[PDB]
Write a protein that binds this ligand. Structure first.
Ligand SMILES: CN(C)CCCC(=O)Nc1cncc(-c2cccc3[nH]ccc23)c1
Ligand SMILES: CN(C)CCCC(=O)Nc1cncc(-c2cccc3[nH]ccc23)c1
Ligand SMILES: N[C@@H](CCC(=O)N[C@@H](CS)C(=O)NCC(=O)O)C(=O)O
Ligand SMILES: N[C@@H](CCC(=O)N[C@@H](CS)C(=O)NCC(=O)O)C(=O)O
Ligand SMILES: [Mg+2]
Lengths: 198, 198
């Protein structure tokens, strides 16, 4: 099966998919577009949003729907039906927060305001909830790595760009990040991927 | 299993779970709370949000994570892995849009203006995408009903409270609502359920 992933030249919402392809050792075309090219592609898409994944002439959309599809019947999914629910719940909780940021805001003063509010007021409480949820366990769900751990690592990486001191009082969440980053397939991708801010 | 759903006295984010329970003929306690008992329960919740589902003492959160868990290994989920991806993608698309509305805004004039803005520009754009995606086909995904159809009907029911003429130029989306509402288990629930605005 031939895979083509289309997104902007960033980690962003597409990176979870990039991690999953790397972990499962699946070859794919990593198509990165400029904003100048986007409107022409946008107009042809059913819902006009990216990332999209083309699989055998069939265009999938929604990053987490795609991530779930790719991890289905693999070791990145939950090991029980209930664990799969916990995986989906943690990912959605993270996705809910990341989606609050006005990534596409053109007015800089309004953008900086919102980022500062979310990072200063809201982010610390999410960290507290995540840290308590993890407890003293090795991974977020179950006894082995899932794509929820991937998603945590990806979200936290972007948050740390704007607020470097986010996990100062959360050593266990730092440990989880480093374990995800230590997985060979993930480590390899982290080193070779295009180095962008977001 | 012993199920207990906790949410406000409204359809809201919980209604998709209530539809699935009714369609699959699965018994559960539909616990509806007032504002008075929310702070007490909120403290016991790992992530401080509802709906939540308690399954034999084990708590679950995130409405769509719970919905997907309940539809596991049924035809409601989608027949193939690819269809299940389409189902997930449509639901997330609808959920993304419904999440844009300022449901908890206390400034009534601000709320009015933001609702009007979303219903005038964004809603019609999404409706055209949904309508063309459905085409002249019977259901949104595949040959039979999925919980994506349920979710469309639920979301559109709330949207029609604020803009009654939203689907007046989309007869195919009106037809889809009617088909879902006519499903015996859904028809029974819609008659039974408490009457609320949202
Ligand atoms: C052209 N520019 C204005 C558009 C670029 C959009 C952008 O910066 N996307 C972006 C950048 N960083 C994070 C997310 C994001 C949003 C929601 C959930 C997410 N999860 C991981 C990243 C992520 C999204
Ligand atoms: C005053 N406050 C305590 C009540 C706020 C509850 C409320 O109005 N929630 C609500 C009401 N109507 C729709 C949604 C909603 C939000 C996001 C995705 C959704 N999908 C279906 C409903 C829905 C949520
Ligand atoms: N919930 C969707 C959201 C996708 C989305 O909104 N993507 C943004 C970029 S991060 C986009 O397409 N922006 C360009 C546009 O809206 O025209 C997902 O996770 O895929
Ligand atoms: N993505 C979550 C969002 C849940 C959510 O935010 N629910 C609202 C009520 S509809 C809530 O509990 N808000 C927290 C609060 O204001 O106390 C889900 O779908 O379950
Ligand atoms: Mg979501």
């Amino acid at each position: 099966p031939n895979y083509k992933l289309t997104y902007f030249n960033m980690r962003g919402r597409a990176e979870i998919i990039r991690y999953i392809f790397a972990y499962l050792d699946i070859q794919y075309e990593d198509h990165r577009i400029e904003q100048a090219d986007w409107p022409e592609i946008k107009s042809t898409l059913p819902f006009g949003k990216i990332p999209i994944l083309e699989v055998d002439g069939l265009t999938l959309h929604q990053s987490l729907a795609i991530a779930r599809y790719l991890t289905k019947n693999t070791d990145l999914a939950g090991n029980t039906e209930m664990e799969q629910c916990h995986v989906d719940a943690i990912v959605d909780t993270l996705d809910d927060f990341m989606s609050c940021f006005p990534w596409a805001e053109k007015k800089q003063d309004v953008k900086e305001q919102m980022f500062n509010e979310l990072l200063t007021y809201n982010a610390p409480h999410l960290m507290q909830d995540l840290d308590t949820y993890l407890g003293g366990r090795e991974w977020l769900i179950g006894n082995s790595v899932t794509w929820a751990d991937f998603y945590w690592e990806i979200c936290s990486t972007t948050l740390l760009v704007f607020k470097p001191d986010l996990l100062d009082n959360h050593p266990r969440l730092v440990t989880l990040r480093k374990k995800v980053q230590a997985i060979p397939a993930v480590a390899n991708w982290i080193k070779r991927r295009p180095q962008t801010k977001l």
